[PDB]
Design a protein around this ligand. Structure first.
Ligand code: FAD
Ligand code: NAG
Ligand code: NAG
Ligand code: NAG
Ligand code: NAG
Ligand code: NAG
Ligand code: NAG
Ligand code: NAG
Ligand code: FQ3
Length: 510
């Protein structure tokens, strides 16, 4: 595991403004999106080959509140001016949400929880994974940016509570997604310093890796149909081109939202849809931007009568049908955008525990469609269809019942306002817990867990080597690739995946 240490910006020695036309030319690899998967992918490829990583956002030093645990709230409170590390959006379901716009991607703005994929996930996918290498790649990530968290009083309360509520066994400290209660890893260190995917660029070869920031990739260029390069615009609005050469490849790592958007803008997607927008079809595929998922977050907020210490989430309660955590949160008068599903939600006057359950899968899905047929800076439309699938609603009911059981534990009893027998002894911010009343509560108070995925699925858009079917020299590696979560907290899987696929590409080519 990593030690406590300052965020390592050594890689800035090979980070350039996209305004620099001398970045234009031929590379072995172009990676689109310097995010969770993109950074370790570009770093891994750079060991042997000339790599250009293109990121639309700027560098994290521009936004210092990205670099500490106590800055997390600030980035969600900050208004979206088009340059900030948090890009705000609202799904067509009406649920507020955010995505990253910064070098390091969503690892620079997230809640830092680190876990490995459920070990059953690999065989569920039917992909022929090299499982030894998957595990070597987790250790490569974890040695760089993951710590064993110190004890935090609220996380310890919640962990005792989960165990008392029957979320067994006690797994102690473990990175594994397994049934029961555990302390997991964190990408915040014990000093509260954020570590992130951008630090994995420090593993790249500084003679082979170049990173362009404020590089907005607008189109994949095509040739036996092959990807050959990209068009990208800089912060001044000028256009630039970069190309791959020989046996090289373009990899799209622009995320659940960015990947399908760029594929559609490039003419890769459903024929009738693209034809309807007068976008010339390069490669018809009915599934680009289809099977987009957002695992529901359902929650209560308790307001203890005595202050609790704020905490980062480290203690997880895992069952097959729900994944539960709690954060202890300082009061604020500026809302954290997407913490609550709309801007019309009460402000907390005192410290509160946000007590949460996540629906696995989920089975409900929607889509990403273009808002503009030309401008990548215009966010696409996204709809998740929360609770359209009744299995999802059934699983939320089970989770909400378990949060009921948690509020009844001796662990939580000291946080009640009134020493009465029932959970009405708590004071709530927003809607308290109440099968039909649990269904209404699930449907009406749903928020994003922020762990959205899909839009470029393996088995739909991609083959088992993450290649776009029908196109040579084009891959996709990010959270657009899988229809189900790998675990409760997927950043660990997607960081591993960038390097892993990087290694498969180098092997394929060797
Ligand atoms: C607020 C929040 C909290 C979270 N908390 C946790 C947690 O604690 N633990 C956890 O495991 N998971 C957490 N997640 C989820 C997890 O962090 C993400 O699912 C994962 O990081 C997604 O990785 P990605 O590579 O698919 O996307 P990203 O990391 O978002 O990378 C995509 C990159 O592409 C760039 N980009 C997009 N389009 C273009 C373009 N056209 N040209 C150039 N660049 C482009 C973006 O700016 C971005 O940097 C959280 C998510 C959020 C939003
Ligand atoms: C890139 O250069 C422009 C001036 O041409 C400036 O406005 C911008 O802030 C620079 N971006 C970065 C990331 O340095
Ligand atoms: C990979 O690591 C996990 C623990 O995360 C372990 O259960 C599993 O046996 C390992 N698998 C292999 C193939 O080594
Ligand atoms: C962490 O500290 C808390 C004190 O609140 C203690 O109860 C808990 O047992 C500790 N956990 C471990 C694994 O040491
Ligand atoms: C597509 O172009 C044709 C002209 O060839 C026009 O009739 C039609 O309205 C256009 N559709 C859109 C959505 O631009
Ligand atoms: C792990 O994934 C497998 C297969 O997809 C599933 O059967 C199991 O419920 C998951 N375990 C947990 C604890 O989520
Ligand atoms: C673009 O987005 C807005 C809301 O975000 C939506 O209401 C509008 O109709 C969208 N346009 C298209 C063409 O999808
Ligand atoms: C829910 O999802 C499964 C696919 O995983 C499907 O069999 C079923 O039709 C869906 N249920 C509903 C209510 O649509
Ligand atoms: C549990 C979850 C979703 O994640 C982490 C988190 C942090 C804050 C910080 O102020 C507030 C709420 C919150 O919620």
């Amino acid at each position: 595991l990593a030690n406590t240490s300052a965020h390592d910006f050594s890689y800035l020695k090979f980070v350039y403004n996209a305004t620099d036309t001398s970045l234009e030319g031929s590379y072995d690899y172009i990676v689109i999106g310097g995010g969770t998967s993109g950074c370790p992918l570009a770093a891994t490829l750079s060991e042997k080959y000339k790599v250009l990583l293109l990121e639309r956002g700027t560098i994290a030093t521009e936004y210092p509140n990205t670099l500490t645990a106590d800055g997390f709230a600030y980035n969600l409170q900050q208004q979206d001016d088009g340059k900030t590390p948090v890009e705000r959006f609202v799904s067509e379901d009406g649920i507020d949400n955010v995505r990253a716009r910064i070098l390091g991607g969503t690892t620079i703005i997230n809640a830092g929880v680190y876990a490995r994929a459920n070990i059953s996930f690999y065989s569920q996918t039917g992909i022929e994974w090299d499982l030894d290498l998957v595990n070597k790649t987790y250790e490569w990530v974890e040695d760089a940016i993951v710590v064993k968290p110190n004890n935090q009083s609220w996380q310890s309360v919640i962990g005792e509570g989960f165990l008392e509520a029957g979320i067994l066994p006690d797994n102690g400290f473990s990175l594994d997604h397994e049934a029961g209660t555990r302390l997991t890893g964190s990408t915040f260190d014990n000093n509260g310093t954020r570590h992130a995917a951008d630090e994995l660029l420090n593993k790249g070869d500084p003679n082979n890796l170049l990173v362009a920031v404020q590089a907005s990739v607008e189109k994949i260029l095509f040739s036996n149909l092959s990807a050959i390069g990209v068009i990208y615009t800089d912060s001044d609005g000028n256009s630039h081109q970069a190309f791959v050469r020989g046996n090289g490849e373009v990899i799209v790592s622009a995320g659940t939202i960015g990947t399908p958007q760029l594929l559609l803008l490039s003419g890769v997607g459903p024929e009738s849809y693209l034809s309807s927008l007068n976008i010339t079809v390069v490669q018809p595929n009915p599934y680009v931007g289809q099977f987009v998922y957002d695992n529901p977050r359902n929650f209560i907020n308790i307001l203890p009568p005595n202050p609790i210490e704020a905490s980062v989430v480290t203690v997880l309660g895992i069952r097959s049908d729900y994944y539960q955590v709690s954060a202890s949160v300082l009061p604020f008068s500026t809302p954290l955008f997407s913490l609550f599903p709309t801007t019309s939600y009460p402000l907390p006057n005192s410290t509160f525990a946000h007590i949460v359950s996540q629906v696995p899968g989920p089975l409900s899905h929607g889509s990403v469609t273009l808002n503009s047929s030309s401008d990548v800076r215009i966010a696409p439309n996204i709809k998740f269809n929360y609770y359209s699938n009744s299995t999802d609603l059934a699983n939320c009911v089970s989770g909400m019942k378990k949060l009921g059981d948690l509020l009844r534990t001796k662990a939580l009893e000291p946080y009640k306002a009134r020493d009465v027998l029932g959970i009405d002894g708590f004071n709530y911010l927003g809607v308290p817990l109440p099968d039909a009343s649990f269904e209404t509560f699930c449907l009406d108070n749903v928020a994003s867990y922020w762990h959205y995925h899909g839009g470029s699925l393996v088995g739909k858009v991609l083959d088992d080597s993450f290649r776009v079917m029908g196109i040579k020299a084009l891959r996709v590696v990010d959270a657009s690739t899988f229809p189900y979560e790998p675990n409760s907290h997927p950043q660990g899987f997607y960081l591993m995946l960038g390097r892993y696929v990087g290694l498969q590409i180098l092997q394929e080519r060797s």
